[PDB]
Amino acid sequence: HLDVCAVVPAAKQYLSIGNQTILEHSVHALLAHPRVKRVVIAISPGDSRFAQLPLANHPQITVVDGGDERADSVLAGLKAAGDAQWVLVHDAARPCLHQDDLARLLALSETSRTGGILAAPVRDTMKRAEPGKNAIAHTVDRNGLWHALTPQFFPRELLHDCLTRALNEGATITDEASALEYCGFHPQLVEGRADNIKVTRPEDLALAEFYLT
Amino acid sequence: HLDVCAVVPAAKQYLSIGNQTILEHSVHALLAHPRVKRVVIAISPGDSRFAQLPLANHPQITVVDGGDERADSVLAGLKAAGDAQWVLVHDAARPCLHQDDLARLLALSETSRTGGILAAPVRDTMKRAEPGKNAIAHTVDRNGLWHALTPQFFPRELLHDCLTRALNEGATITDEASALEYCGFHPQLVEGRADNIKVTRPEDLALAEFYLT
Ligand SMILES: [Ca+2]
Ligand SMILES: [Ca+2]
């Protein structure tokens, strides 16, 4: 029951922070938890950097070719997830994940049949702009509004089916949770640290390093 | 026309970053722009720290007693705003404001009669929780969704009237923009840097220092 397989769609992740790549910081955070028995990393075909990393020969790491879209790479990862009952999907560019948040997320397998994700409550006042221009239409109630983060933890086959159906029906998919939502599910929100950022822009690297060390 | 009076409701701001208090970093960012001819700082009665700051004897700074609510302190500030046609309201705890953002915000007085605010576009996927629990109701479209920041720049008397009416009618007020919104106005959104954070929690101080220096 407690066995978990992680999937990291990695098809910025190769930038480094302390002689270790962001991807490695990311993957090592997952492998720190005892329940994570395997990590499947989906990389783009032609990606010649991964093979030169220590992760390439790790006994608990399996590499597979990813796809064009995020959901595509996650589905590819799920195919090498063995018989794992629960899957943990985590961003390749989120190296600041903390063990306490991860542990609280994994607890969901004992109290939920849908799974859930790490999220941070909205602090700032939010505004909805008017369609087509930079004018404020109205203020969006921030109460009950959350920033979706990762990992996202769900039963393996359910995640597979939801993302498979969402794609077939051409649904607008953002994160893994949105695939469950599209199929009528309502994943749990597990509060996590706001410093769990995704390195996407140049400045993000320096900030990630600040958070990490 | 171009004369602007700033109001800072300061009734964390006294924590320091480099031998200078957050309030000072904040106020000095406003005074850096030539158009800001005056800064009215509203402090709580009994606040004995302000008087011991250099801001207390600055020729362009006026101090007044603030109130119980934010809108209350801003209204008090507006009373000492002289005949300024446009007012710039800025958080006492936002020391990372940059001159380029400020300058672009002030340009609104030449192209708008309602004013506007500094804001950062939402990046993360947002989730709306179900009423009463930590379960995801659905994903909130982040397109056209913005993080409201400060300064907030509006015609002086209009701001006064909108906040005066909003309060009298017991409306739910968050920022100054929300007061204009309540009265049927739609302030402009001027994109600003996301590093313009408000120091509210212990960790925010270290982060602010990182952004500043
Ligand atoms: Ca391990
Ligand atoms: Ca000046």
Curated annotation (Swiss-Prot), chains A, B:
Pathway(s) this gene product operates in, as recorded in its UniProt entry: Isoprenoid biosynthesis; isopentenyl diphosphate biosynthesis via DXP pathway; isopentenyl diphosphate from 1-deoxy-D-xylulose 5-phosphate: step 2/6
Protein name, as recorded: 2-C-methyl-D-erythritol 4-phosphate cytidylyltransferase
pH dependence: Optimum pH is 8.3.
InterPro entries the record matches: IspD, IspD/TarI, IspD/TarI_cytidylyltransf_bact, ISPD_synthase_CS, Nucleotide-diphossugar_trans
EC id: 2.7.7.60
Functional summary from the UniProt entry: Catalyzes the formation of 4-diphosphocytidyl-2-C-methyl-D-erythritol from CTP and 2-C-methyl-D-erythritol 4-phosphate (MEP).
Site features described as Positions MEP for the nucleophilic attack, chain residue numbers: R142, K198
UniProt keyword terms in alphabetical order: Cobalt, Isoprene biosynthesis, Magnesium, Manganese, Nucleotidyltransferase, Transferase
NCBIfam families named among the record's database cross-references: ispD
Family membership noted in the UniProt record: Belongs to the IspD/TarI cytidylyltransferase family. IspD subfamily.
GO-annotated biological processes: isopentenyl diphosphate biosynthetic process, methylerythritol 4-phosphate pathway
Annotated site (Transition state stabilizer): K12
UniProt cross-references to PROSITE patterns, sorted A to Z: ISPD
GO CC annotation: cytosol
Other notes: There are no coordination bonds that occur between IspD and magnesium in any of the complexes examined to date.
Record text on subunit structure and interactions: Homodimer.
Protein's UniProt keywords contain Manganese: yes
